[PDB]
Amino acid sequence: DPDLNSASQLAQGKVYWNIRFTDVPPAENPNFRVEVTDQWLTEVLD
Amino acid sequence: MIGMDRRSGLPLSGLAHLKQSVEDILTTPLGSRRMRPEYGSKLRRMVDMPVSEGWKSAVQAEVARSLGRWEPRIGLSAVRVVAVVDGRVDLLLSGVFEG
């Protein structure tokens, strides 16, 4: 930590480290969105 | 060759006789003729078949078959599927003119 590691904090023995991370969240709601598009309807031409 | 018109009975030889024979063939089914079960087309059986790339290989065959059997005075140029609108399949049939 560049802020909490001061000159006076280190003079007392206090030295700080930051460990930021993200856990793996359980996929409790896998959503699927199904859509009937006519975009590839023009692909049947040849 | 001189034939009669379908409606109105008029004797026409070149233009509409070649048209009243081709446009009839595409919508006349097989077996509708009496004692001639091989005249007609499978195009009435191509209804509600799924429009695939193997389906166009059949329609371009059945146009070349059913006109190749019973209409030798027409040279087929191209049967191109040009539009699929709402299930309706637009097949362009440009035919040459003879005589």
Nearest chain B CA: its distance from A43 CA (Å):
9
CB contact under 8 A, A44 and B81: yes
User: How far is residue B57's CA from residue B59's CA, in Å, rounded to a whole number?
Assistant: 6
Q: Which residues contact B31 (CB under 8 A, 6 or more apart)?
A: B37, B40
Structure tokens at A2: 């560049």
Structure resolution, Å: 3.5
Nearest CA in chain A to B57: A46
Task: Give me the residue label for tokens 């991370």.
Answer: A21
As to burial, measured by CB atoms within 10 angstroms (0-12 exposed, 13-18 middle, 19+ buried), residue B31 is exposed
Give, as one character, the DSSP assignment of residue A39.
G
Nearest chain B CA: its distance from A32 CA (Å):
27
